[PDB]
Nucleic acid binder design. Structure first.
Lengths: 114, 271, 101, 88, 70
RNA sequence: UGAAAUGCGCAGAUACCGGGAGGAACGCCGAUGGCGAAGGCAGCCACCUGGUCCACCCGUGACGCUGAGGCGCGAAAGCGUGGGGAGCAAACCGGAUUAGAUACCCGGGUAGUCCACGCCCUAAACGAUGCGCGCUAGGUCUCUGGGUCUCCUGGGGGCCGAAGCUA
RNA sequence: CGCUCAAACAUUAAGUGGUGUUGUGCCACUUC
């Protein structure tokens, strides 16, 4: 919560939206944005431009929190995937290091009818 | 598992009775400090506080070492898996090399001649009784205390047991014979393993009599009675409930919770 | 009588008074079900690959014995009980299969 | 499994002449050990149907060998059937 | 590219304790390298996988590491 | 989600960190691959166990093949008794679609799916090819066993094709 | 402007329904 230096952004990319979060070097959400923190509704939220606006929004509020250096860990497969990071370049926030940790089971729970 | 019957008679083409293959060829209960008189079809004032009792079979109580801590680290070779007509389970007349003989609910996995013993230094091994602090998490366990130095009284019915979920503080979490995830002080004794005669539930009484032999008197239904006797009193043709289904004292009978709100024991239970 | 590679892990966050109190319970334990200690190694603490019990350290033991097989299970069973005994894996020992000989 | 040395104990007590490991004797006696060994297994492994397949196969083969060993020389059969306590 | 096996020496592929050695087939992903990267053979490939999981239960060989820079 | 809506959310949800409960299923290896009589069989550990293959030419000495009837195994769904229930999910209700939509699509949802014990004995139970044996060019890929081995020699899985067969 | 209706009309080779739009009170399925 407190004005701090380092940090970590979390890209959650779905398929009908995409969300993220600035979170202190501990793992606790400082700020966060989505496809709805952009205004766009429904499918628009599966959009890279919506994602740009998301990241911009997210990171933006971090810089108002003194944020500068942030790591990156992303999950999902949304059209705003890479875009949610590439917006985080022209964000002024040091992308200290980007990492992919998308959840993937050793195969266990039987999947929905798709 | 259980003994059926050819239908040489009705109420006997369903009625089954347990295969006492577990009983150690023994009928005479240890006349020793074990069997003592037992009685009481109703309460102290000559009244009735539990409809439908009596007609038993004349029984002797069997004294049961539930506490089992007054004899720590004193090994007792099992002697007998006996019939006891006052529980869902069999009893196990155990003998200590201390000479003295006692009685313990017959757990599941109890053969005759086990080096069972009480106390904490005892191996977490079926039939052995010890404080939960020494029994690892997950271990099934019957006849459980509730407050230290108070005695067992949880999971003492045929095939009933409690599992240990984990440690928290000076308490240990048990999933009771009900799924009630309650905390119980560590210094409380238990008895590694679950309870015996688990195969009992699958009995079928069969006829009225069998019920009666037990002592369960014929229970007359609500709507069978009169408006004077019971809420469902209509009796005006096989006629429905006036609403809502209710006890002979008025309290709704389906889904009305009754455990007192603020029993100080709430803070010791989850779900 | 068969050859086995019994494996174990220890709670790294403990001394050598309780630790040399721990190894003795695997000793006492083994001899109970006739385990004939052979070439025994000990690679102590070890930077683990994935967190077990929330501590990335685990004091490794390693035995290798001749024993009655029909109780090889009840050896492992015994070993795990100690709350300070995290990992336990019994296996039957085998010949060096060569790679890049 | 079946110890190789307690396997030789068998041939020894059944070998109708040292250096013999093919006599229908040694063969029947053999399968029997495997049979009863397998019989017992399945006793407390009832679910193992797979393995029951074999239990039939080993039996057939044994019943067959016994056919011949009876059909050719009767006297010898009589002595065997008893040593092995079979045909009940 | 290159053959992993052709970077090392003479090592028994059954000692589920030589991490440094085994780890070299683990990939910077935590995935059991496919045949066409390690340069193993049929026979060999399977028992390698054997002592792999055997050591993964010993906190010795990582199960999965989120990918580095991307 | 084709777009949505029902749904859920200022009861503070979605996303994220940590701790715990629970079940099922086994990512990478992993495959043109292995095994099984068939049904079928994937974390790993141990124990119990069937079948199978090669080398030695040691053993018995035609004891073989098939097999009406019988006997046993037999996916799935299903059924009885008891336990279990995270995910999925007929039926079931709801959103949309549609002229109508008991369907497709979506949100929720119970038996079931899982365990034991029993019953069920069905099938595109398919290689739609009963089994055993001898005979009739080779080429190439793979699995596996033996042999001083750019090679032969057995066994198993594919493709291509001598002869022949076939509507 | 929105909402319900019986027709004229338009979309199809045709039919059907739908719908489009005016008028009115306030692509789907099928062709013996």
């Amino acid at each position: 919560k407190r004005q701090v230096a380092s940090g970590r952004a979390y890209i959650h990319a779905s398929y009908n939206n995409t969300i993220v979060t600035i979170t202190d070097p501990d793992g606790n959400p400082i700020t966060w944005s989505s496809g709805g923190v952009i205004g766009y509704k429904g499918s628009r939220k599966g959009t890279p431009y919506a994602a740009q606006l998301a990241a911009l929004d997210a990171a933006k509020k971090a810089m108002a929190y003194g944020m500068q250096s942030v790591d990156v860990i992303v999950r999902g497969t949304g059209a705003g995937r890479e875009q949610a990071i590439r917006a985080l370049q022209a964000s002024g926030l040091q992308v200290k290091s980007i990492v992919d940790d998308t959840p993937v089971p050793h195969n266990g729970c039987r999947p929905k009818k798709k | 598992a259980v003994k059926k019957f050819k239908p040489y008679t009705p109420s006997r083409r369903f009625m089954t009775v347990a295969d006492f293959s577990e009983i150690t060829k023994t009928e005479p209960e240890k006349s020793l400090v074990k069997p003592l008189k037992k009685t009481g079809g109703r309460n102290n004032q000559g009244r009735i506080t539990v409809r439908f009792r009596g007609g038993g079979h004349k029984r002797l109580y069997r004294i049961i070492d539930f506490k089992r801590w007054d004899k720590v680290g004193i090994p007792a070779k099992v002697a007998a898996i006996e019939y006891d007509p006052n529980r869902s389970a069999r009893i196990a007349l155990l003998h200590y090399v201390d000479g003295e003989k006692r009685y313990i609910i017959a757990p599941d996995g109890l053969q005759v001649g086990q080096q069972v013993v009480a106390g904490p230094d005892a191996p977490i091994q079926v039939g052995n009784a010890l404080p939960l602090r020494f029994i690892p998490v997950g271990t099934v366990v019957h006849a459980v205390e509730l407050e230290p130095k108070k005695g067992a009284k949880l999971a003492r019915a045929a095939g009933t047991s409690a599992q240990i979920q984990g440690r928290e503080g000076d308490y240990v979490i048990l999933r009771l014979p009900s799924g009630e995830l309650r905390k119980v002080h560590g210094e409380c004794y238990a008895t590694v393993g679950a309870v015996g005669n688990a195969d009992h539930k699958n009995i079928v009484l069969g006829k009225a009599g069998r019920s009666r032999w037990l002592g369960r008197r014929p229970h007359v239904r609500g709507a069978a009675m009169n408006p004077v006797d019971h809420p469902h009193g209509g009796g005006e043709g096989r006629a429905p409930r006036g609403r809502p289904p209710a006890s002979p004292w008025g309290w709704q009978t389906k889904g009305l919770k009754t455990r007192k709100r603020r029993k100080p024991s709430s803070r010791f239970i989850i779900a | 009588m068969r050859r086995y590679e019994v494996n174990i892990v220890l709670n790294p966050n403990l001394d050598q008074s309780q630790l040399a109190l721990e190894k003795e319970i695997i000793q006492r334990a083994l001899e109970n079900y006739g385990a004939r200690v052979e070439k025994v190694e000990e690679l102590g603490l070890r930077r683990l690959a994935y967190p077990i019990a929330k501590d990335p350290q685990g004091y490794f033991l390693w035995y290798q014995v001749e024993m009655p097989e029909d109780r090889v299970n009840d050896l492992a069973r015994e070993l795990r009980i100690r709350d300070n005994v995290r990992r336990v894996m019994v296996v039957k020992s085998q010949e060096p299969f060569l790679a890049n000989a | 499994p079946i110890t190789k040395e307690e396997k030789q104990k068998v041939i020894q007590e059944f070998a109708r002449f040292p250096g013999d490991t093919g006599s229908t004797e040694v063969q029947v006696a053999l399968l029997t050990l495997r049979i009863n060994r397998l019989s017992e297994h399945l006793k407390v492994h009832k679910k193992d149907h797979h393995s029951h397949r074999g239990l039939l196969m080993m039996v057939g083969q044994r019943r067959r060998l016994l056919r011949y060993l009876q059909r050719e020389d009767p006297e010898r059969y009589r002595a065997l059937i008893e040593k092995l306590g079979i045909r009940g | 590219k290159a053959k992993v096996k052709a970077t090392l020496g003479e090592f028994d592929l059954r000692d589920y304790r030589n991490v440094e050695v085994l780890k070299r087939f683990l990939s910077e992903t935590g995935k059991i390298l496919p045949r066409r990267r390690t340069g193993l053979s049929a026979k060999e490939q399977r028992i390698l996988a054997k002592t792999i999981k055997r050591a993964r239960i010993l906190g010795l060989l990582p199960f999965t590491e989120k990918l580095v820079r991307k």
